[PDB]
Amino acid sequence: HSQLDQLLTGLVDRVAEVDHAVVLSEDGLVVSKSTGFLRDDAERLAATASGLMSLRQALIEMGKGYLILTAAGPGAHLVVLTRQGADVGVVAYQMNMLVKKI
């Protein structure tokens, strides 16, 4: 488990609002994921995020919760899935602090 994997797993563990997290390369490759996020589920999130960016940041609210995406430097994006009713401000702050730590 890489340092980035531990950071992502740490975000998910500490933040009640955050269910899963991945970091995707410019090409859509999963570079890192929270350790309790299965490869099938992570790549499903990756396929969604890559579709989003074919259509920098994005925030999509649904019934489920939110999908939030932000830049993690010029070559990658951090992508998070929240639980239902999460405070977006809290999650965005946590993600911004994570990107800083990387």
Q: Kindly write down the DSSP assignment for every residue of 65-97, as one continuous string.
A: -EEEEEESSTTEEEEEEE-TT--HHHHHHHHHH
Upper half-sphere CA count for residue 18 (Cβ side, 13 Å):
28
Distance CA 85, CA 74 (A): 31
Q: How far does CA 33 lie from the centroid of its chain?
A: 8
Cβ-Cβ contacts under 8 Å for 97 (sequence gap 6 or more): none
Look at residues 37, 33, 23, 34 and name the one whose alpha carbon lies nearest to residue 71: 23
List b or e across 63-72, with b for residues whose CB sees 16 or more CB atoms inside 10 angstroms. eebbbbbbeb
C-alpha dist (Å) from residue 40 to 43, 47, 66, 101: 5, 10, 19, 27
For the chain, give every domain's residue range.
1-102
Helix (H, G, I), strand (E, B) or coil at 19: strand
User: DSSP letters along 31-47, please?
Assistant: EEE-TTS-HHHHHHHHH
The experimental technique used to determine this model is X-ray
Distance CA 99, CA 73 (A): 8
Nominal resolution in Å?
1.9
Class of domain 1-102 as given by CATH = alpha beta
Query: Which structure tokens are listed for 67?
Result: 């999908």
